[model samples]
Target: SKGEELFTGVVPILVELDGDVNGHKFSVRGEGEGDATYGKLTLKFICTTGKLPVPWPTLVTTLVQCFSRYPDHMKRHDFFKSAMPEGYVQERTISFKDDGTYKTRAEVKFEGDTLVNRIELKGIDFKEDGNILGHKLEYNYNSHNVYITADKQKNGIKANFKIRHNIEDGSVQLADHYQQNTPIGDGPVLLPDNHYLSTQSVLSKDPNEKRDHMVLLEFVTAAGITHGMDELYKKLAAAL
Candidate 1:
């Protein structure tokens, strides 16, 4: 009973085998147990695809696909999509490992179609949970605020925010939401001399009924937008 109790809960080692701008294919690759005898796997799904790359539009598409899998579970799926946001941001400070370079902490937060949002991060060796620390990023010395906002206007959706990176003020603004003159809102948003990725999303509030509320837009950036969620969220799902 002692060792068995060390294994429980829906603890799955989310592994990434390979992925692209479409989606990802994962594996049941993790170890350790909890309150039960290595508690059986509660989540056995490929997760299909969710975010192709961007934060908002990509994740929105993904939530749509997830709902498709459990069409009967409306409230559950709706709550899930409502949980995530357009995208999250992460700031990593790494050091040398026995093998190579590795990161010790990573903080991130994401948003959805609505104004609501969520913040999460992991300090591997610096905290109890590697995903989100309740106390702070590293004591109270570092500010762990992912301050941002979204505005739904005639164009699409506008987002603005400011975050501190390594003790410096870093700001970002995602305006216009999507391409205006493309054939199907599919092209690169040109800001003088920069090209960003793009994609589409169809979200809903009911799992059984597709709201068909879709958007053509861009995610965070290349690291955030081109995250292979478009094809992964082929069915639409909620973020639990």
Candidate 2:
């Protein structure tokens, strides 16, 4: 009666972010089941500043390089070296601890190409009519992924999810990142092992670093999936 294919075909999805970075849009043209790789993604980056520039174009590339080399620290200004004359301004409120921990709040604004991003997240923060979004979510860091249920009652219309499967929709699928296995909701694991699962940071080891560290680690992990859609949109837009 089960284990057969219950869903299949294009599952249209739209995710909108409205905040410091306005009109942040994302959409996916996917199938009924399996994984995200089978779907196509699209993204539109509309900066609040009514202007665009070439310097801003390198924003995404610089970020990838920066994230790929985390904790070691990357040059702030050098990352923006691609900016124009009055190009960009980057600011941060970061606190570092003696325990090899750190917490940072930063902001970056520049021309068009145009790129940039964000930080911070709390468990079940988004709420409406008294429902906790985090409660509706599940994740397995070892699986190198997360799953969120769409229906209020668990699995219904797009209820199951695998974070990052389509990673730019096939351009890159880092399955090895989730090779290890860890039970969900156990706590954090530090140091790297092929099998350990962790969000791995706090707002200063003692306070905030640990907090923000896991926050971002969780975000980028998810970002890779969303970026797949956004990136495909960029590439397709260029095809015109």
Candidate 3:
């Protein structure tokens, strides 16, 4: 019974291994995991090429951290984007009602030097989530009345909030919410003259399917130069 419970409702570790034809056949590899009730649990990255000299022993050691294989269920693109080179943003839209009363967007974007990944609520019925152009829905919804706080990191800042929902009888429902962005590796080429090593995320209700209850987006970026497989692997191992 104790062991079986460990697998119940657990968000499994996600992994992505990709090959890039930079005229040289580059391979991008990354692995990470997060728990909504907690924060980031693991993040591992590496780059490999047949022509490059690599020290296998050091890499194997550096990537050595608590690792557990988990299920990967989201769309492949969504799940693997974490391993892609930075400066890319993806958006998806959903129409909750045909009458134009409910529509929402899910976006992944970098904020300042920080990267924030979130499942958003927008349009008429969900405006209370926050102004479409303004930010704070995730902060306010989780804990409607609690005081929010900021966390300063090496290259960026973060905040944690409580999200609350109103029930049919007009009762409030609260859940854990956190928003953070940071430049984790190289930087972002999407914009010029900027470099930040960070990662960020926010978990909330699914932006598309009301039938599903939970959603998450973890954002990370890199630019200019690709990190050495050994160094990046070490960085990811240490963070987890």
> In candidate 3, what are the lDDT values of residues 65-115, reduced to their tens digit?
011122232111121123122322222232222111212222333344223
The CA lDDT at 101 in model 3 is 24
How much RMSD separates candidate 2 from the native structure? 22.8
TM-score of each: 0.17, 0.18, 0.21
Q: Best by TM-score, which number?
A: 3
lDDT of 2 by residue, 1-240 (tens): 010011122222211222221122221111111121222222223333333211121111111111111121111211222222122222222111111111222222222322233322111122231111112111212223222112213111111222222222233222111111111122221222111111221111124322111111211212212223678888989999
Q: Pick the candidate with the highest lDDT.
A: 3
Q: What lDDT score belongs to each candidate, Candidate 1 first?
A: 0.21, 0.21, 0.29
Give lDDT tens digits, candidate 1, residues 103-135.
211111122211211212121332232111221
lDDT of 1 at 187: 25
RMSD of each: 21.6, 22.8, 23.2
Clashes of 1: 41
